[PDB]
Amino acid sequence: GVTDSSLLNLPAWKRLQSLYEKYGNDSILSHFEKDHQRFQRYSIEIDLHSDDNFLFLDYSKSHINDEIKDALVALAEERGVRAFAKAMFDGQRVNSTENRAVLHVALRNRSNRPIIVDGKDVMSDVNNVLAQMKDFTERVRSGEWKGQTGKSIYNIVNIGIGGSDLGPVMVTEALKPFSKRDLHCFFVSNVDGTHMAEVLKQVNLEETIFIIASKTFTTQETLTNAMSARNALMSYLKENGISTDGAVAKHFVALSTNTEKVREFGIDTVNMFAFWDWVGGRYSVWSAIGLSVMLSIGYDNFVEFLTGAHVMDNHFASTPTEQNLPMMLALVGIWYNNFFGSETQAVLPYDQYLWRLPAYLQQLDMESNGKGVTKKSGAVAVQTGPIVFGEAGTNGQHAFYQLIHQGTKIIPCDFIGCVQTQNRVGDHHRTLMSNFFAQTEALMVGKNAEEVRQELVKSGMSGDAIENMIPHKTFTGSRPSNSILVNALTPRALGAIIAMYEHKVLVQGAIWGINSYDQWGVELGKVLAKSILPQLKSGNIVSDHDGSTNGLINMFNTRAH
Amino acid sequence: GVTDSSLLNLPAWKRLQSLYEKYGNDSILSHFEKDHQRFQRYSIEIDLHSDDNFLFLDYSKSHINDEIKDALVALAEERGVRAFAKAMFDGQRVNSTENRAVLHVALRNRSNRPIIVDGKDVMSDVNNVLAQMKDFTERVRSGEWKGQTGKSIYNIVNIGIGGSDLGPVMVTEALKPFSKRDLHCFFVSNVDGTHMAEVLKQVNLEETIFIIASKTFTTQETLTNAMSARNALMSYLKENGISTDGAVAKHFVALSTNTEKVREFGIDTVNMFAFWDWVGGRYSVWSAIGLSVMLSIGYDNFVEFLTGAHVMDNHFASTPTEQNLPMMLALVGIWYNNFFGSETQAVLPYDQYLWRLPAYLQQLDMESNGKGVTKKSGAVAVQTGPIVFGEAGTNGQHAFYQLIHQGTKIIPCDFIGCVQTQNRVGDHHRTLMSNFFAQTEALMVGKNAEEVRQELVKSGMSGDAIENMIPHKTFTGSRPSNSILVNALTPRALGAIIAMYEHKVLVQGAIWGINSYDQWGVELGKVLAKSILPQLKSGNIVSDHDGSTNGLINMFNTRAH
C-alpha cells in the first residue's frame, strides 16, 4: 500500500487527541492537588521473588489524569497488544517481514513452558546450550581449563559486533560486583585491528581464551579479527618453540551454528555454543551470545539474570493493562511521543554500574522502532520511535540537565535508581539519592517568579537588578519524569530492567503497527559503500553520484596519501 | 518582562517562514539537479596554515536553495551577530546575567591582540600562566621532577568535575597519537571515592602527581577526593617510613586563584595555575584547566591546539557571513531546529579517537543554549538549543542508524572525518571513508519503490511476496547531513573543530537572543537535594513535598539498610 490511516481512525486514538487538546496544558502539579493518593494510583510494584528485591515504577510525575489513563488503556486493548504478545510468546511468526519467530523469552523460560517452532520444542535447545555453557564456564572459572602451556585462564576477549557486543558490555559492566575480579574481559568489535592489537600486547596469550561470535562463522568483519588473534597465537608458539598441536582448540571458542566451519578454524565443536534465528541481535545477551557475561559472573548469577527477565515476562503476560508495568511505561511514552510531539527519551540511571545502559537502550529501542511502515505494508500515519539518549547520574549530574530544566523541549525522563548500595562507605549513597528524588521534584514543581523574587530580596539584591534577573532564574516546572526503583542492582534486578524495556518497545511497536524485530535500514548504506570503495584510489575522479558525494569522494582522492 | 515577540516580528524571520512553507517539501536532490556546482557553492574550506591541513564543511546535503540561503544570511545581519561577536572578542560583558566577559578566545590569542578588562590586559595573565605550564610540563615530561622517593613521574590524576573534566578527557583521548605513551592520565570526577580508590591501588604513589582543579580551592566535592589522595600519600610514607617533609608539594598541584588556601593544602604556589571568571567551564580546556592535556601531548602540541582555535577565531571574525563557516553551520542548524521543528542534532565522528566528542558537544551546546529566556528578560518566542547525541562511526556504525534512515524524525547529522590516517595498516581507512561518504549519500538519495522492486525481482522473489515487502525496504531519502572534513586530526585540527562548534553555539544564541554563557538551570535541583538529604534516615516519614516525592523519599526510608 501507500498510507495506513488505520490507527489514525481508531475511536481510542481520536479520543486521546481530544483529551490532549483539553487537558494538555494542565500542570503536572494540578493532578496531585486533586488526589492525595495519586502516587499509589500511578505506580506499579513487581515482586522479584527473592531477597526482598523488587522493581517499582512511579509514573505519577506526568500530564495524565484518570480519563487520559483510561483512554491509553483503551488504546492498548483496541489494538490487540496483549494478544500480540501472547502470539509472540507462543512462537508464532510475528516478525512478518523476515517470516520468523521472535523468542528471546524462550532463552529465559525457566518454567520450560514448551514453545513449539517448526515441529520442535525450542527449549530442548535452549536448555542444552545453557548446560553446555555451564560446564564450560565452570571449568574456565575454576582454573581447570588450561592453555597450551598448562596455565589457567585469566582473560577473555570476545570478538563480535553491534548487538552481540553492546549487551555483553553493558551487563558485565552493570554487574562487576558479582564478577570474578581475577579474570578480565575485553570486547573487540572495531574493523581495524587497533583494539585487537591493543589487547594482544596486554594479555599473556598463554592465559587467554577468545570467544568468536558469528552465526555463519564466515562474516569477514569478525573473522578478520579472529584471524589476527589466531595468527598471533601461532606466531607466539612458533617463536617460543611450543607445539601448535591442539593449540587453537585450547584458546578459542565459538558462538555459532556452523559446525564444520568452526571446526576448520581449529575450534573444538564441543565449544560451539549455538543460538537461533529468532534471537535478534538486540535481544541476544540472554543466549549463548552472553557467554562472556556467564564467564564473568558465573552460571548461578546468569540464571538469576535470566530469572529476573522471566519474572518480568510472566508479569507482562498475566497482568491486566492498568497495572501492567511495561504496558504503562509504553503508554506514558506514547502519550509524550505522539500527542506532545516529543522526539526524545532520556534514560538517567543513578548508579555508576549502569553507565552503559542508555547506549544499550538506544540500540534496543531505536533500531526496533525506528521504522517508517506498518506490517500491513502502509506508511505509518504517526510518529514512531523516539531518539534515546542519556548518561549515569553519578558523574557530572549536570552536563545537559541545564536544558532538561530551562530549555524549550519537553523531554520524557526515566530516572532509574536503587535503594540499597553495593558498599556502606560514608554517605555517598544518600547524597546520590537526595539528587535522584530532587531532580524529579525540581522538574515538576519548578520555581516561580515570586519564589525567586522572595529569594533575591533575601540575597540583598538591588531593587532594580532584581526585576530583570527573575526570569533567568525561574523554572517553568510541569516537566515529566518516571522514577524507576529497584531494591538492589543484582543479576536478577538487571534482568528485569532489561526485559521491561524490551516489552515497552514491544507494546509501542504493536500500537503503531510496525515490525519491531526487523532492521532493513542498514542495507542502503552498505550497498552504497561497497560501490564507493573501489573508487577510493589516488587521482581517481568519479561522476556517477550526485555532485556532493562526487566532490567529497574526489577531494579525498586528490588529497589522500 | 513576560514574552519577547521581538525575533518573531523581524522581516527576516517571517520571510524565512514563507520560504519554508513554500520550498520546505522540495527534495534535497532537487537542488542539485538545477545547479551542477551546488557542492562548491554550499561548502567553505578554511586554510589551517600548516602542513596542508584544512577544515572543510559541505553543507550541500540540505533543504536549502539560494533564496533560503539569502534569507538565513539576512537573519544573521538583522540580528547583529557579527557585532555581538566583536564585542565578546573585545572583552565587553556579554554574559549579561553574571555581568562578566566571555573570553575563551583570549586563552588562544596567539597574536596577543590586547584584550582589556577592568583596566588590565588579560593577555599578560594568559601568557604568564601558559609559560608557567610550559616550565612545569617540561620538567614532568623530561623526568626531572621527582617524587618524594626520588623517582620520575609516570601518572597524572586530574581531580575536578563536569566541564573541568570533559574537555581534558575528550582532548587527551582525541590526541593519544601525539601523547607521551609512557605517562598515563586518569580523570577522577565522581563524588564517591570509588574511582579515586581504583586509581590509588593502580598507581604507584611514588610516581604520581595529582592535579586539583578548583577556583576557590574549597569546593567540598573535589577537595574530598583531593583529601583521599593526600591522606593516602601521608599514609603510604608513614608505613614505609619515608619523611613527609615537603611531600605533598612534590605530588600535588593546583588549578586555582586562591593562593593561601592552596598553600595550606601543602601545595607549592609556584604550582598554582590560574584561570579566570571569564572562562566558562564548558570553554575551559584552552586554559590552565587543560594542564593534563599539555602534560600528555606536551607544550608545543598544546600551542598547536590553541593555534587551531585562533585560526578559527580569525576566520569567524573576519569573514562575511555567506562564506563564514561557523555562521553557516549555525544557520543550517537554525533552519532545522526552528522551521522543520527538529528537536535533535547528531554528531557522528568517523575517527575512533573522537569517540568522546559528541559528549563534549552535549555539554557545550545544551548547557549553553538550553535556555528559556532572552537577555532582554522576556520568555523566548522560539525553540532554542537542540538535544545533542552521537557516537564514533568506527564501531557499531549501525546501532541507531536504523532510525536515522527509516524512522519518522528528521535528524540533522554532522558527519566528521579525516582524509589522512594516523597508520597505513591495510585498507581500514578507505573502508571506513567509503561508509563515511556512503551514509550521507544514502540519506539524501534514498531507495525508491521501483529500485527495490527491480532489485527484488532479480533476487528471484515470488511475484506476490514482492509487492508487500517493497515498503519495508524503501528509503524516503531527502534527509540532511553536513560532511565536515579535516586533512588530519592533529592538535591544530582538533582545536579548530572545537572552536567551530563554539562559535556555532555563539551564533545561534545571538540569533535567539539568549545568554549562552550562564548556567542557572542547575540551582533548583541542588537546593531541593540539600533539603531532601537530612530527611533520608531510617524510619523517617516526610510530608512537606508533593505526594510522589513524599512516597519515594518514604519508600527509601522504610526499605533502606
Report DSSP letters for A86-132, one per residue. HHHHTT---BTTTTB---HHHHT-TT----EETTEEHHHHHHHHHHH
Place of cell 561522476: A543
Query: Backbone phi, then psi, for B146, in 5-degree steps?
Result: -120, 140
Q: Measured between CA atoms, how close is B465 to chain A, in angstroms?
A: 10
Using left for φ > 0, alpha for ψ between -120 and 50, and beta otherwise, residue B294 falls in: alpha
Residue B370: closest CA among A476, A29, A441: A476
Of the partner residues A58, A409, A467, the one whose CB lies closest to the CB of residue B548: A58
Can you tell me whether residue A194 is helix, strand or coil? helix
Indicate the helix (H) or strand (E) that contains B7: none
The three grid cell numbers given for residue A306, joined into one nine-digit string: 535470566
Query: Testing the interface with B: which of A406, A479, A553 to mutate, by most B Cβ within 10 A?
Result: A406
Report CA-CA distances (Å) from A479 to A63, A340, A406, B522.
8, 12, 10, 15
- Between helix B163-174 and helix B291-318 the angle, nearest 10°, is 90
A477–B contact, CB cutoff 8 A: no
Angle A428-445/B547-559 helices, nearest 10 degrees?
170
Burial of B121 (0-12, 13-18, 19+ CB in 10 A): middle
Architecture of domain B514-561: Orthogonal Bundle (1.10)
Catalytic residue among B173, B304, B367, B391: B367
Q: How far is the C-alpha of A217 from the C-alpha of B430, rounded, in Å? A: 25
Chain B residues 145-164 with a CB less than 8 Å from chain A: 161-162
**Contact in structure between A175 and A182 (CB atoms under 8 Å):** no
For residues A254 and A262, what is the distance between their CA atoms, to the nearest angstrom?
Answer: 7
DSSP-based three-state secondary structure for B210: strand
Touching A: B residues 84-143, CB under 8 Å: 97
B398 is catalytic: yes
Q: Which of A67, A88, A77, A54 is nearest to A17 (CA)?
A: A67
**Among residues 315-334 of chain B, which lie with CB inside 8 Å of chain A?**
none
Give CA–CA dist B304/B344, Å, rounded: 32
CB contact under 8 A, B520 and A473: yes
Return all residues near A465 (Cβ < 8 A) that are at least 6 apart. Answer: none
A317 touches A85 (CB < 8 A) = yes
CA count, 13 A, side-chain hemisphere, A223: 14
Q: What is the DSSP string of A292-318?
A: HHHHHHHHHHHHHHHHHHHHHHHHHHH
User: What sign does the dihedral A457-A458-A459-A460 (CA atoms) show?
Assistant: positive
Neighbours of B173 (CB within 10 A): 19
CATH 3.40.50.10490-classified regions of chain B: 1-142+277-513, 143-276
The contacts of residue B442 (CB under 8 Å, 6+ apart) are A524, A525, A528, B405, B475, B477
Cell triple for residue B337? 531546529
Instruction: List CB contacts (< 8 A) between A338 and chain B.
Output: none
Nearest-Cα residue of chain A relative to residue B518 = A472
d(CA A128, CA A134): 10
Pairwise CA distance, residues A415 & A24, whole Å: 23
- What is the distance between the alpha carbons of residues A124 and A129, in angstroms, rounded to a whole number? 9
Q: Do B400 and A388 touch (CB under 8 A)?
A: yes
Which grid coordinates belong to A394? 553519578
Q: How far is CA B526 from CA A442, A445, B73, B406, in A?
A: 9, 14, 41, 40
Inter-residue contact B485 to B58 (CB < 8 Å) = yes
| CB B556 within 8 Å of CB B536 | yes
Interface touch A435/B556, C-beta < 8 Å: no
In whole angstroms, give the CA distance from residue B59 to residue B64: 9
The residue type at A167: G
B439-477 residues labelled b (16+ CB within 10 A) or e (exposed): bbbbbbbbbeeebbbebbeeeeeeeeebeebbbbbbbbb
Chain B's closest residue to A411, CA to CA, is: B387
Q: What grid cell was written down for A293?
A: 557475561
Contacts of residue A505, defined as CB under 8 A and 6 or more positions apart, other chains included, come to: A330, A364, A365, A368, A369, A516
Indicate the burial class of B90 (C-beta count within 10 angstroms; 0-12, 13-18, 19 or more). middle
Residues on chain A touching B47 (C-beta within 8 angstroms): none
Do B247 and B233 form a contact (C-beta atoms < 8 A)?
A: yes
How many whole angstroms separate alpha carbon B135 and alpha carbon A497?
52
Residue labelled with grid coordinates 538565513: B72
User: Which residues make Cβ contacts (< 8 Å) with residue A450, sequence separation at least 6?
Assistant: none
Grid coordinates representing B530?
540539600
Largest CA distance in chain B: 87
CA dist B330 → B154, B162, B339 (Å): 42, 25, 14
Alpha helix stretches (DSSP H) within B111-162: 122-141
Give me the sign of the Cα torsion angle B520, B524, B526, B531.
positive
The topology (CATH level 3) of A1-142+277-513 is Rossmann fold (3.40.50)
Helix (H) or strand (E) holding B330: helix B325-338
Distance of CA A398 to the CA centre of its chain: 23
Catalytic residue flag (residue B367): yes
- The type of residue at A508 is Q
Alpha carbons B277 and B102: distance in angstroms, whole number? 8
Give phi and psi for A334, each to the nearest 5. Answer: -60, -40
Interchain contact B437–A (C-beta under 8 A): yes
Whole-angstrom distance between the N-terminal and C-terminal Cα of chain A? 49
A8 touches chain B (CB under 8 A): no
End-to-end CA distance of chain B: 49
Q: Burial of B370 by CB count in 10 Å (0-12 exposed, 13-18 middle, 19+ buried)?
A: buried
A428 CB within 8 Å of a chain B CB:
yes
Structure solved via: X-ray
Task: Compute CA distances A158 → A149, A214, A291, whole Å.
Answer: 21, 11, 9
Angle in degrees, 0-180, between the axes of helices B325-338 and B291-318, rounded to the nearest 10: 90
**Pairing between β-strand A481-486 and β-strand A413-418 as defined by DSSP bridges:** parallel
Q: Which residue has the cell 595555575?
A: B273
Q: For residues B373, B378, B379 and B384, what is the CA-based torsion angle, rounded to 10 degrees? A: -40
- The CATH number of the structural domain formed by B143-276 is 3.40.50.10490
A 353-372 residues with CB below 8 A of B? Answer: 359, 362-363, 366-367, 369-372
Show the cell assigned to B143: 623526568
User: Could you tell me if B36 lies within 8 Å of chain A, comparing CB atoms?
Assistant: yes
C-alpha span between A288 and A98 (Å, rounded): 22
Instruction: State the smallest CA–CA distance between residue A112 and chain B in angstroms.
Output: 32
Contact at CB, A363 and B399, closer than 8 angstroms: yes
Which residues of A form the catalytic set? 367, 398, 526
Are A535 and B437 within 8 A, CB to CB?
no
Q: Do A552 and B469 touch (CB under 8 A)?
A: no
- Residue B417's SS3 state is strand
Contact A532 B161 (CB under 8 A): no
Q: What is the resolution of this structure in A?
A: 2.6
Q: Which residues of B fall within a CB distance of 8 Å from A356?
A: none
How many residues make up chain B in this entry? 561
3-state DSSP helix/strand/coil % of chain B, to nearest 5: 50, 10, 35
Rounded-to-integer distance, Cα A106 and Cα A31, Å:
41
Size of interface A-B (CB pairs under 8 A): 397
The C-alpha atoms of residue B343 and residue B365 are separated, in whole angstroms, by 13
Of B419, B421, B286, nearest in space to A560 by CA? B419
Using alpha carbons, select from B435, B392, B155, B132 the residue that is nearest to residue B288: B132
What is the C-alpha separation between A164 and A187, in angstroms, rounded?
10
Q: Write out chain B residues lying below 8 Å of A519, CB-based.
A: 402
Please name the residues in contact with B42: beta carbons below 8 A apart, sequence gap of 6 or more: B58, B59, B60, B62, B64, B69
Q: Which residue has the cell 544518600?
A: A430
Cα–Cα distance, A272 to A211 (Å, whole number): 10
